[PDB]
Subunit: 118 residues, 2 copies
């Protein structure tokens, strides 16, 4: 029941955290790649939400590095789409498990999360 939220947008990351805390999830937030990298084995989560509109983080390369470094505890990757769609389609192709598109409901978030583990 551990969830890592990766987003540079602190207000959005906080808003995501609130909805997950209602649905009884333990949340950690990373605003950058390094912190996301560390928390992947320091917090050791089951699902990682990964925002694809981070100017200083490329989601594709996160997915790439995950499956090409033979990392243990490799979580389910829920990709959060926005401005781009070529990025989104090749993130799922690269190895994102499921996605959310802008805009998404709080229920659409939790149903995506529950479909990912069950």
């Amino acid at each position: 029941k551990r969830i890592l939220v990766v987003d540079d947008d602190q207000a959005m990351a906080a808003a995501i955290e609130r909805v997950l805390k209602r649905d009884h999830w333990q949340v950690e937030i990373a605003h950058n790649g390094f912190d996301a990298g560390i928390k992947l084995s320091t917090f050791e989560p089951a699902i990682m939400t990964l925002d694809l509109s981070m100017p200083k983080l490329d989601g594709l390369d996160v997915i790439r590095s995950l499956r090409q470094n033979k990392v243990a505890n490799q979580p389910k990757i829920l990709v959060v789409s926005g401005l781009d769609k070529a990025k989104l389609q090749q993130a799922v192709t690269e190895g994102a498990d499921d996605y959310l598109e802008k805009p998404f409901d709080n229920d659409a978030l939790l149903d995506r999360i529950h479909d990912l583990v069950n």
Copy 2:
């Protein structure tokens, strides 16, 4: 103690030149070009030393140092900060916990002196 060094730098050529000097000096080297790879390799490779470039436009070296302190990572490497124009960022990195620094441009033997000083 080990001979493992993680070189963190987005400049592929600078990271390759650092790696060449360390390899020739009998160190085992991995490279990360971005923060996520750096953070992943810190677990999977467990370096004794991490060299951290302060001129990475997508990585703030202060965030790396603070993330290591705040998450309380086991078996942390010693951090050699590699600094460019921003002198205030250099001093901030050192005060916040960087173990040593190296100012760019540097010679091969200046790199080696720092690396050897961290392990001695």
